[model samples]
Target: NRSLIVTTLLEEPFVMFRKSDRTLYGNDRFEGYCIDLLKELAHILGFSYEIRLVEDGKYGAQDDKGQWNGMVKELIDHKADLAVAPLTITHVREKAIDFSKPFMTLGVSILYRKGTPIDSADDLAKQTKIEYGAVKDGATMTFFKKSKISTFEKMWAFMSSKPSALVKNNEEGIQRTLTADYALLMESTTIEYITQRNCNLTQIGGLIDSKGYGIGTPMGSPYRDKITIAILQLQEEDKLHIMKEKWWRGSGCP
Candidate 1:
């Protein structure tokens, strides 16, 4: 039996630490949508996998020096065989790595503390009184640039001017929003998962940009075809949707 090395980041609903604090090893250490999806894929593909966290704790982004870091780099360097997290499939990433067919569809959205004056992207653009931020090198930030929306352009300009308006990650952005008068622009799927667990946090307005999450592999990886086939099969059987509903909209959140 072939055993593959899988890398993923610790993101809520997609992948996360289990509730128990006891020391855990192997696959027992975590559980979420990605974990279940990987399990199904293993079953269908007749392979076993070991899940490990990305060293840098980033979804993966390029620096100003044109270097890659995070999960993408792991795949690029052959440090991992696959990435099964909620990694958004973007043009920049696609150029360096291969992605399976999208297993989850999502869109960019605002995660804000309830009772904030802002109700929509337009509302954020119209006001400068409230501080808003997004992940510094994330797909959402890239979306803001290419979205070509007047409001988003204005909002991005404001966010760019404030040094504090850029966060290292979605968790930081969400934490700031929770503790202060701030809002975070992130994936709707993540916002939904957070809002379900945190009553004070809620999604604002509708989706800003639509996209999909794919299982990532190194460019031209031999496993890409097999992974895509498994994903398509799951989608056809509606198992993918069921896993999402089970994890993303589980009974934990009202």
Candidate 2:
């Protein structure tokens, strides 16, 4: 009679309250791309999950002490059944938990001030004067830490040399890029989302590399492949594109 437990956090466009002031209870209180996506998946896969906000509100992180965060433990310890939030797939994460095929793809891109003469990411690495960074513990930062590409290696060196260059959140990084002559390297999807709402910011270059936002599941869980197949079915039917358009639409800037 009971359903699976769905674990996720509040993330813009992915998951958010429809309205905070409105009095609501249970699952009816929230709506977003992930919420709708969850509904579709539930309908298709016969899911009646209990949606729960993560206790830690962390996507995933490994601190210097090598401690993992809530997002992974819930799956590993068999607390949560499915995670619908857009968690980036990394090799390290792959070892502990399984992820479905991506519902959406993303790649690294730069957020720059409107008047920048820079054309490509290479320009950012070549000039320290402009200043650049990524979210401190984010996928972009992790990618730079691991990537062997020459330009990315150079960029990582430049960023790592200055601890101040690393920021903690996309919003903080975006703010720094706006007020200072700085560039924030982040998910391309975010670049699209932020630039849509902020005309003063522009994407400087094309994708540096590509990755996906996959549904999270525990290793050896029954729901893993079923959820993956549902996503592919939705993808084939163009439902994924519709959800993107529905959630991504924003008032255009001049």
Candidate 3:
């Protein structure tokens, strides 16, 4: 009956705070891909929304005790009506909440210093000289843990063996990569954004696994279907690509 609460995180190129000399408030305080997409979904579905950042600033993952954190918990608690972020749609997450069709497809990839013998995940796993890891409590971290692939299993083993290997966020991972002989396994989309800005960094290889960014809602929520339909329409109209082009155009290292 009223504007829904849309939970999200500032994931650069996805959802970032807009820069202005004067103070901004509410929705105007934010900008980027998801913000634009959320505006469209609300416009198409005739729903008003109020955006809020997730308290934990995580994409969402379960703990050792099976407690969910990040946007997933927000939905489970019905504290937020929608999670309009670069949230991955994984099988583990599907059981906990409903997701609209993926608005953007991506996969896990590697980010490392520009020149290195490490060309792939296998290369990183085979060497100890260059430390590697993913964001703690992030979907990529769970992806490695849940996977049965032997190479990735070894990678996970190495990452879990050292607390210094895992980072709290992409910024931390990027800094570690820049300052040391390290690699960060993270979303290809994020790698793309970073590599474009920092010429010293480059994607080591192609995606290891395929997944998509989706809008999440509580189980049995009616918004899922409509949002999926709206996403389909937007895809058909090529608006999604247009938006990606808009936000991704500025050059940093060019």
Candidate 4:
């Protein structure tokens, strides 16, 4: 029997490039959480697989070649059997693809350089000293724009003191925040990455809102049901929670 394989986009914390070794590391420098989860899922379903790498930018964006411009397209075109990136499951994307039950839930968070006065949304709404930024065309920015927080007439009116600077992605948002007098509102996962890697920034406040990440397949693919079931089983056994806590929790800063 042939092994099933999957394609993935690299995004730090979830997935990242190791510049020193030029390889990949995930789930806190061990196995990728999604990769491990999928392997467990296949085991339950009596399957075997090989995990294949896809170039993150080219495979995960809009492009020609009739590819869906991402690993989801790779799966649709038979270039890969599955996808395991930290791809968000949304109604828009769902129109063209199927998704397993959510494996992780996340929300938007603000990251500011350490010592910055911004501490919470309340602080953000009150302060006039800092400008903000979000990634353009990315999930976080889109989520922020449409999220209830941004649309509330009263809230928006109060927080409108500074215009948010929109950039192309989380990296850019973090860069602008680090080098200039700006703060970044990004996905919690990416926020964690930025804070850990840069050492000059910190994430504060609770999640702005919640969303989920799922194992995606071409719309109507037969694999969706089995994948969803596997995700639930893992949750029931506490494997998912354990994995999350292991990586995300830590002692207070030194």
RMSD for each model, in Å, please? 2.1, 2.0, 1.1, 5.3
lDDT per residue, candidate 4, 186-239, as tens digits? 778767655655667889787977888888777777788988888889999999
For residue 192, model 3's alpha carbon misses the true position, in angstroms, by 0.7
User: Best TM-score goes to which candidate?
Assistant: 3
Ranked candidates, highest lDDT first: 3, 1, 2, 4
TM-score of 2: 0.90
* TM-score per model over all chains: 0.91, 0.90, 0.97, 0.72
Candidate 2 — which residues are off by over 4 angstroms? 64-66
- Could you tell which candidate, 1 or 4, scores higher by lDDT? 1
Model 3's TM-score against the true structure:
0.97
Model 3: per-residue Cα lDDT over 1-254, one tens digit each: 99899999988899899999999999999999999999889889998889999888887889889999999999998999999999999999999999999999999999998867678899998888889999988889999988899999999999999899989989999999999888999999989888888898999989999999999999999999999999999999999999998887747774
Q: What is the Cα-based lDDT of residue 85 in candidate 2?
A: 89
Candidate 2 local lDDT, 9-30, one digit each (tens): 8877788887877798888877
Candidate 4 stretches greater than 4 Å from native: 17-30, 56-68, 72-78, 120-129, 145-169, 192-200, 249-254
Error of 3 at 90 (Å): 0.2
